[PDB]
Amino acid sequence: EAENDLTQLANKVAVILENHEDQALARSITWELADNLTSIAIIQDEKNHWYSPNLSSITVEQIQHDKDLNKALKDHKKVSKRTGLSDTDTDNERLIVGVPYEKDGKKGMVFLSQSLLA
């Protein structure tokens, strides 16, 4: 049910990013969708990424260090994985949903990370 709702949300974020000409605006709309347990990491390209502001956050390094997440990122493919993340005190297991998006030829990714309650 976390997957269902987070996968739905991810694709909306995808629609939003893809259908605004102004990405900075599309990001500010997007951040309003992250709840106290969910955070978002938008990765447009190698030099450009942006994090939902403030337990549930995920970095480019945490992604590149997950072989299944990194593959998805590299290969521009959707991924749904449940895992603890690397290099964090908050090693709590999270649901993670990554979804590709494209704008003006700029292929990007939107990763969503949700804290899993015990």
Catalog residues that contact Cl ion under the rule CB under 5 A. 49, 53, 89
Q: How far is the CB of 41 from Cl ion (least distance, A)?
A: 9
In the complex with Cl ion, the residue whose CB is nearer, 9 or 51, is: 51
In the complex with Cl ion, the residue whose CB is nearer, 8 or 90, is: 90
**Contact yes or no for 113/94 (Cβ under 8 A):** yes
Q: Whose CB is nearest to Cl ion?
A: 53
Q: How far is the CB of 117 from Cl ion (least distance, A)?
A: 22
Q: How far is the CB of 42 from Cl ion (least distance, A)?
A: 9
In the complex with Cl ion, the residue whose CB is nearer, 8 or 84, is: 84
End-to-end CA distance of the chain: 15
Instruction: Report the C-alpha dihedral over residues 85, 65, 33, 13, rounded to 10 degrees.
Output: -150
Q: How far is the CB of 80 from Cl ion (least distance, A)?
A: 21
**Contact yes or no for 33/12 (Cβ under 8 A):** yes
In the complex with Cl ion, the residue whose CB is nearer, 12 or 49, is: 49
Closest residue by Cα to residue 75 from 109, 41, 50, 44: 109
